[PDB]
Amino acid sequence: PQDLSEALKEATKEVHTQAENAEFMRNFQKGQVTRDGFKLVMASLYHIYVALEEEIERNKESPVFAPVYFPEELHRKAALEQDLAFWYGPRWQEVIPYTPAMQRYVKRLHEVGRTEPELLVAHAYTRYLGDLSGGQVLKKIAQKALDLPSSGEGLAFFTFPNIASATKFKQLYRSRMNSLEMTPAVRQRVIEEAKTAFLLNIQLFEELQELLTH
């Protein structure tokens, strides 16, 4: 529709179905998921979010992003650090993978943050509102298909403790998104960038699939 929040949802309907159709992701939704494959996505998420949250800090005051700056409600680096400590041990930082597909997603993220600020909301949107909704889905699936120990850790990423109601926060986040002042050209690029974000995730999944199989 007319609101950015709805235009984004509709324009990415197509690429989202492609995400779900990604073999690696398709195999995940069907229960079949290795511990090593889940580690690869947690590692992927760590790099993606480090990059994204760095760029958000750089533009926290920019009028092109300030409205959607919710540091406390959304930060995920810390949670991912906690999980990675569990999945990879105390020396996780020296042993986690950093593949080409991860490097490319990070590269674009930095390009946006440094030279195309007006589009950062596109990536913030794709990730945060996407993980807020999808999270509870993959968490459950993994929770069982993995059989992790009662160590009480490793899945912190899937819970946003500073958000009482996902529905209320989303409503507020969409509201802030819709309050963003942008020209038609900028708006179109924001929508295209959301598509690009999806593509980056799709090829990341493709790469993680060829890795898991060798």
From Swiss-Prot:
The UniProt record lists the keyword Cell inner membrane: no
Site positions (Important for catalytic activity): D131
Main location: endoplasmic reticulum
Membrane protein topology class: Single-pass type IV membrane protein
Swiss-Prot/TrEMBL keywords: Apoptosis, Endoplasmic reticulum, Heme, Host-virus interaction, Iron, Membrane, Metal-binding, Oxidoreductase, Phosphoprotein, Transmembrane, Transmembrane helix
Posttranslational mods: A soluble form arises by proteolytic removal of the membrane anchor.
Compartment(s) of residence: Endoplasmic reticulum membrane
Class of this enzyme: oxidoreductase
GO cellular component terms attached to this protein's record: cytosol; endoplasmic reticulum; endoplasmic reticulum membrane; extracellular space; membrane; mitochondrial outer membrane; nucleoplasm; nucleus
EC number: 1.14.14.18
Cytoplasmic face residues: 1-214
Tissue specificity: Expressed at higher levels in renal cancer tissue than in normal tissue (at protein level).
Domain of life assignment: Eukaryota
Annotated positions binding heme b: K9, H16, Y125, R174
Induction data: Heme oxygenase 1 activity is highly inducible by its substrate heme and by various non-heme substances such as heavy metals, bromobenzene, endotoxin, oxidizing agents and UVA.
An example molecular function term from Gene Ontology annotations: heme oxygenase (decyclizing) activity
Catalytic activity: heme b + 3 reduced [NADPH--hemoprotein reductase] + 3 O2 = biliverdin IXalpha + CO + Fe(2+) + 3 oxidized [NADPH--hemoprotein reductase] + 3 H2O + H(+)
Gene Ontology annotations of biological process type: angiogenesis; cellular response to arsenic-containing substance; cellular response to cadmium ion; cellular response to cisplatin; cellular response to heat; endothelial cell proliferation; epithelial cell apoptotic process; erythrocyte homeostasis
Disease: Heme oxygenase 1 deficiency: A disease characterized by impaired stress hematopoiesis, resulting in marked erythrocyte fragmentation and intravascular hemolysis, coagulation abnormalities, endothelial damage, and iron deposition in renal and hepatic tissues. Clinical features include persistent hemolytic anemia, asplenia, nephritis, generalized erythematous rash, growth retardation and hepatomegaly.
Quaternary state and interactors: (Microbial infection) Interacts with SARS-CoV-2 ORF3A protein; the interaction promotes ORF3A-induced autophagy but is unlikely to be involved in ORF3A-mediated induction of reticulophagy. Homodimer and higher order homooligomer. Oligomerization is crucial for its stability and function in the endoplasmic reticulum. Interacts with FLVCR2; this interaction is potentiated in the presence of heme.
Family that this chain belongs to: Belongs to the heme oxygenase family.
Domain free text: The transmembrane domain is necessary for its oligomerization.
Name of the featured protein: Heme oxygenase 1
Gene: HMOX1
Region of the whole protein represented: 10 to 223 of 288
